[PDB]
Amino acid sequence: PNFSGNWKIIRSENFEELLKVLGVNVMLRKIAVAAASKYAVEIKQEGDTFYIKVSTTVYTTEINFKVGEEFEEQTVDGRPCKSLVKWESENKMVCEQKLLKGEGPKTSWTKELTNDGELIMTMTADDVVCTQVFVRE
Ligand SMILES: *C/C=C(C)/C=C/C=C(C)/C=C/C1=C(C)CCCC1(C)C
């Protein structure tokens, strides 16, 4: 599997519902949904080490990790967390997150490379799953 690429979003489902679970108010939810229709994920993969840059029009952030090694990032709604990525299969990884301070919904994400050349990213907060689909530029 080679996740490396400049990925462009083509589909985003249930993102507003995810943000609702996370306590984002309705107006900012709609604005965030609009930002998601634009956004890109750049991946550089070397073996089990991943460099990921997620960007929208006005914001960019970097996720760096090695599979199986704890690291710190933020949840979708922006709360700092400790994260651990594991493979679920040849082409799919899963990340469990634990809040660094306080409580909140159980969050996680997955990244999958399909046989058709798509990247599928899911983000979960409790029972609500957002699914996002990208293609390479
Ligand atoms: C492997 C790829 C990962 C973990 C990508 C994660 C992307 C996000 C958490 C992006 C979240 C966004 C917002 C919270 C609001 C603006 C739009 C997004 C989709 C960039």
Dist CA 7 CA 135 (whole Å): 5
Q: Does residue 94's CB lie within 6 angstroms of at least one atom of ligand 1?
A: no
Domain extents in the chain: 1-137
Q: Does residue 67's CB lie within 6 angstroms of at least one atom of ligand 1?
A: no
Tell me how far the alpha carbon of residue 97 is from its chain's centroid. 12
Residue nearest atom 11 of ligand 1, based on CA coordinates: 76
Q: Does residue 39's CB lie within 6 angstroms of at least one atom of ligand 1?
A: yes
70, 60 in Cβ contact below 8 A? no
Dist CA 106 CA 90 (whole Å): 25
Tell me how far the alpha carbon of residue 59 is from its chain's centroid. 15
Give burial (CB, 10 Å; 0-12/13-18/19+) of 20: middle
Dist CA 75 CA 21 (whole Å): 12
Amino acid identity, residue 63? I
Q: Map the chain to HEC letters.
A: CCCCEEEEEEEEECHHHHHHHCCCCHHHHHHHHHHHCCCEEEEEEECCEEEEEEECCCCEEEEEEECCCCEEEECCCCCEEEEEEEEEECCEEEEEEEECCCCCCCEEEEEEECCCCEEEEEEEECCEEEEEEEEEC
Dist CA 2 CA 106 (whole Å): 29
Q: Does residue 12's CB lie within 6 angstroms of at least one atom of ligand 1?
A: no
Architecture of the CATH domain 1-137: Beta Barrel (2.40)
Find where tokens 């609009």 sit. 34
Q: CA angle at residue 76 from 69 to 131, to 5 degrees?
A: 95
Q: Does residue 85's CB lie within 6 angstroms of at least one atom of ligand 1?
A: no
Dist CA 57 CA 113 (whole Å): 25
First and final C-alpha spacing in the chain: 18
What is the position in ligand 1's atom list of the atom closest to the CA of 59?
Answer: 20
